[PDB]
């Protein structure tokens, strides 16, 4: 309410005290009336302030929300003087915040004062002396184009063409970054005559950092043109961008390749995009081969169905037989993430003849990330070929990966094991795969041990309780006499997940005498894991055994020497309501 008090607080020589007093600029404007903040507060921000860039960043973030505190959407052009000064500041985090706030303010404008206050603001930033103002002018053409008159929007196209032909490459890099966004609000005959010559010039630019941004503009331009003139306008620019001498432009064609396939159409994809895709997979730079290997599944999914399996088997598949044996490890790992996904496209018999040797060659690769990516999609080939064919060709490679050196590869087989065991049947699992799941429980890595206990819960839901009682219950109860204390707790961890699925009778008569026996274990870590397990399997037992066999053990563990055994037993007595 006094203006002469807070003018010195916002001009205080401490920098932090100017920062807190300007982050609370909404509460100062709320205390002032909506007419005096136009006449005193906003000219003060216009005239006086210029400071540290942390203050200017906080100032630009506040003024994007002042559209109600200034008097509503018909007085919002008073926020344009201060925001124009922050759009020319050299630091890039404040002039990006100022151009972000300038777009939010522009929607509150009328269509009449857009041509009176916002369009002259864009034309003054676009004709500024320094490049920091011309860069901030590039992000303001799309939010003010489609609401102005035809004579004004003819001037906006001229001022955008001057930014695309700028002297400095910093503005040309920012004009090309907003070329696709600006082209989506133009009419069709003006994209065809004004956007195309300024898109074709930015793709023949001397700086490759400008040329690669014209490739991302080629996706947005081609998707709003009709299919008949894509050959005479867009296609010679895209054909010379795939053959560019800079690898950074060839990387952007390969990274945006599936978006170029949907935007252009299915007919020019057969003619031009398929031979251009072969040259990107056989590229001299390993970064371009890895980018063209990520797209090898999605490119073949969206081909025309009249010629899908003929193009893949004759043009694509000879090129991916050489990316399997590539020298670089990123291209081998990128192909392996998506090579199993083109198994439903080729069919059953083409997968056995042509794709199955490529899968076995990557299940035995020396890189662990190639082996990780090829396991994670093993169900997708399982629905194409049968379980009789999976068990013949790929199952000796899966059993061999169950004892892999890297534990992440061992973990990927365990997560696939309940899906594989359900299809193979219980008579095949007990003979050839049951010893694999029991050998994971005594592994050295703990994350393999805890993934094998959760594997035992998923196995008995698919096979039943009486399969567990005859096969895997006496295997995990003999683990309680292991002289390593890390494996004695695995018996307790197995009982925590098996008790909820094998019911009350198997828990009381087979697993409860084991958790009560090892409550006199010498290691203290086993002794409170007994008390943490009696809390877990407690509700599954009935009230008769909970008061005569569980409660006298939990009372003895509260007299233990160790403080953590004494705590967890006392915690289990209240959860079991035995206090």
Partner 1 sequence: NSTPPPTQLSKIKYSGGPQIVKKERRQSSSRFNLSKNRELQKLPALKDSPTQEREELFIQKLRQCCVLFDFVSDPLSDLKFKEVKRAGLNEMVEYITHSRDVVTEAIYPEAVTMFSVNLFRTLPPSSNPTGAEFDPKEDEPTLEAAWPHLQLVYEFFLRFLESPDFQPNIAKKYIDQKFVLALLDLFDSEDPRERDFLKTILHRIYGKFLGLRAYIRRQINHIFYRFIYETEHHNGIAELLEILGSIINGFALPLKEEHKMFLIRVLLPLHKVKSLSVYHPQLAYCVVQFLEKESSLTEPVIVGLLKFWPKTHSPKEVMFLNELEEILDVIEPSEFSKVMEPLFRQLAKCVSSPHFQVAERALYYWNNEYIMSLISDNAARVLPIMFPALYRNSKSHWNKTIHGLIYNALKLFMEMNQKLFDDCTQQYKAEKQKGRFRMKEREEMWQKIEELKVLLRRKSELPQDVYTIKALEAHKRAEEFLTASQEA
Partner 2 sequence: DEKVFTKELDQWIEQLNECKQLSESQVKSLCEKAKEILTKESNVQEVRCPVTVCGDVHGQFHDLMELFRIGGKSPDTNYLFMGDYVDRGYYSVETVTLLVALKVRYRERITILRGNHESRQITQVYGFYDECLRKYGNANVWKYFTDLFDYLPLTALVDGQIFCLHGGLSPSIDTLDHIRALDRLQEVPHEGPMCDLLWSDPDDRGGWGISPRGAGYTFGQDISETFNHANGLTLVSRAHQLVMEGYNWCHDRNVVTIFSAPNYCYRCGNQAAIMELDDTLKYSFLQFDPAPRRGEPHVTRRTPDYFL
Q: In angstroms, what is the minimal distance from the CB of 294 to partner 2?
A: 15
Does position 44 interact with partner 2 (CB under 8 A)? The reply is no
CB under 8 A: which stretch of 109-117, 148-156, 162-170, 519-527 binds partner 1?
162-170
Of the pair 362, 490, the CB lying nearest partner 2 is at 490
Q: Are 512 and 520 in contact (CB under 8 A)?
A: no
- By CB under 8 A, the residues from 334 to 373 that bind partner 1 are none
Does position 478 interact with partner 2 (CB under 8 A)? The reply is no
- By CB under 8 A, the residues from 482 to 501 that bind partner 2 are 483-486, 489
- In order, the DSSP letters of 347-398 are -HHHIIIIIHHHHHHHHT-SSHHHHHHHHTTHHHHHTTS-HHHHHHHTHHHH
Q: In angstroms, what is the minimal distance from the CB of 218 to partner 1?
A: 20
Does position 4 interact with partner 1 (CB under 8 A)? The reply is no
Partner touching 117 among partner 1, partner 2, none, CB below 5 to 8 Å by kind: none
| Dihedral, 559, 565, 571, 574 alpha carbons, nearest 10 | -40
Does position 352 interact with partner 2 (CB under 8 A)? The reply is no
Q: In angstroms, what is the minimal distance from the CB of 294 to partner 1?
A: 16
Q: Are 57 and 87 in contact (CB under 8 A)?
A: no
Q: Are 311 and 270 in contact (CB under 8 A)?
A: yes
Does position 559 interact with partner 2 (CB under 8 A)? The reply is no
Q: Are 191 and 183 in contact (CB under 8 A)?
A: yes
Partner touching 30 among partner 1, partner 2, none, CB below 5 to 8 Å by kind: partner 1
Quote the CA–CA distance of 567 and 528 in Å, as a whole number. Answer: 8
Q: Of 3, 7, 74, 92, which lies in the binding site for partner 1, with binding defined by CB under 8 A?
A: 92
238's tokens: 């895209």
Q: In angstroms, what is the minimal distance from the CB of 405 to partner 2?
A: 10
Q: Of 155, 181, 208, 326, which lies in the binding site for partner 1, with binding defined by CB under 8 A?
A: 208
Backbone angles phi, psi at 205, to 5 degrees: -70, 155
Q: Are 495 and 456 in contact (CB under 8 A)?
A: no
Q: Are 346 and 354 in contact (CB under 8 A)?
A: yes
DSSP 520: G
The site string for partner 1 over 448-477 (x = CB under 8 A, - otherwise) reads ------------------------------
Quote the CA–CA distance of 571 and 554 in Å, as a whole number. Answer: 10
Quote the CA–CA distance of 126 and 143 in Å, as a whole number. Answer: 15
Partner touching 306 among partner 2, partner 1, none, CB below 5 to 8 Å by kind: none
Does position 16 interact with partner 1 (CB under 8 A)? The reply is no
Radius of gyration in angstroms for the set of CA atoms belonging to the chain, rounded to a whole number: 34
Residues that bind partner 1 (CB under 8 A): 1, 5, 9, 21, 27-28, 30-31, 52, 68, 90-92, 130-131, 168-170, 173, 206, 208-209, 245-248, 284-287, 328
């Amino acid at each position: 309410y006094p203006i002469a008090v807070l003018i010195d607080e916002l001009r205080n020589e401490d920098v932090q005290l100017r920062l807190n007093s300007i982050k609370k600029l909404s509460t100062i404007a709320l205390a002032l009336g909506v007419e005096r903040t136009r006449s005193e507060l906003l000219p003060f921000l216009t005239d006086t302030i210029y400071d540290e860039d942390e203050v200017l960043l906080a100032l630009a973030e506040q003024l994007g929300t002042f559209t109600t505190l200034v008097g509503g959407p018909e007085y919002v052009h008073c926020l344009l003087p201060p925001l124009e000064s922050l759009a020319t500041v050299e630091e890039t985090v404040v002039r990006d915040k100022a151009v972000e706030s300038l777009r939010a303010i522009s929607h509150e404008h009328s269509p009449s004062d857009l041509e009176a206050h916002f369009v002259p603001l864009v034309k003054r930033l676009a004709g500024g002396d320094w490049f920091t103002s011309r860069t901030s002018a590039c992000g303001l053409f799309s939010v003010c184009y489609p609401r102005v008159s035809s004579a004004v929007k003819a001037e906006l196209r001229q001022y955008f063409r001057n930014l695309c032909s700028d002297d400095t490459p910093m503005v040309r890099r920012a004009a090309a970054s907003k070329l696709g966004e600006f082209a989506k609000v133009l009419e069709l005959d003006n994209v065809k005559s004004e956007i195309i010559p300024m898109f074709s010039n930015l793709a023949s630019d001397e700086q490759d950092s400008v040329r690669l941004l014209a490739v991302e503009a080629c996706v947005n331009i081609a998707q709003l043109l009709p299919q008949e003139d894509l050959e005479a306008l867009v296609m010679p620019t895209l054909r010379q961008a795939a053959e560019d001498k800079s690898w950074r432009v060839r990387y952007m064609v390969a990274d945006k390749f599936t978006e170029l396939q949907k935007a252009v159409g299915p007919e020019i994809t057969k003619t031009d995009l398929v031979p251009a895709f072969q040259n990107l997979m056989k590229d001299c730079e390993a970064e371009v081969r890895a980018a063209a290997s990520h797209k090898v599944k999605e490119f073949c999914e969206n081909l025309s169905a009249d010629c899908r399996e003929n193009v893949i088997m004759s043009q694509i598949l000879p090129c991916i037989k050489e990316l399997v044996s590539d020298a670089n490890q990123h291209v081998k790992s990128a192909l392996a993430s998506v090579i199993m996904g083109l198994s439903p496209i080729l069919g059953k018999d083409n997968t056995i003849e042509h794709l199955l040797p490529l899968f076995l060659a990557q299940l035995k690769d020396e890189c662990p990330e190639v082996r990780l990516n090829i396991i994670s999609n093993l169900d997708c080939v399982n629905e194409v070929i049968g379980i009789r064919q999976l068990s013949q060709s790929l199952l000796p490679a899966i059993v061999e990966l169950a004892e892999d050196a890297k534990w992440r590869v061992r973990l990927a087989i365990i997560e696939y094991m309940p899906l594989l065991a359900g299809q193979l049947g219980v008579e095949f699992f007990d003979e050839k795969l049951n010893s694999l799941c029991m050998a994971w429980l005594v592994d050295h890595v703990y994350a393999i041990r805890e993934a094998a206990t959760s594997n035992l819960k998923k196995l008995v839901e698919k096979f039943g309780k009486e399969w567990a009682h005859a096969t895997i219950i006496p295997k995990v109860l003999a683990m309680s006499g292991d002289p390593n204390y890390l494996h004695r707790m695995t018996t307790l961890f197995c009982i925590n997940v098996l008790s909820e699925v094998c019911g009350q009778d198997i828990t009381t008569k087979h697993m409860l005498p084991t958790v009560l026996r090892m409550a006199g274990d010498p290691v203290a870590n086993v002794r409170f894991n007994v008390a943490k397990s009696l809390q877990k399997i407690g509700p599954i037992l009935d009230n008769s055994t909970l008061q005569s066999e569980v409660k006298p053990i939990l009372e003895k563990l509260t007299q233990d020497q160790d403080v953590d055994v004494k705590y967890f037993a006392q915690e289990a007595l209240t959860v079991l309501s035995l206090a």
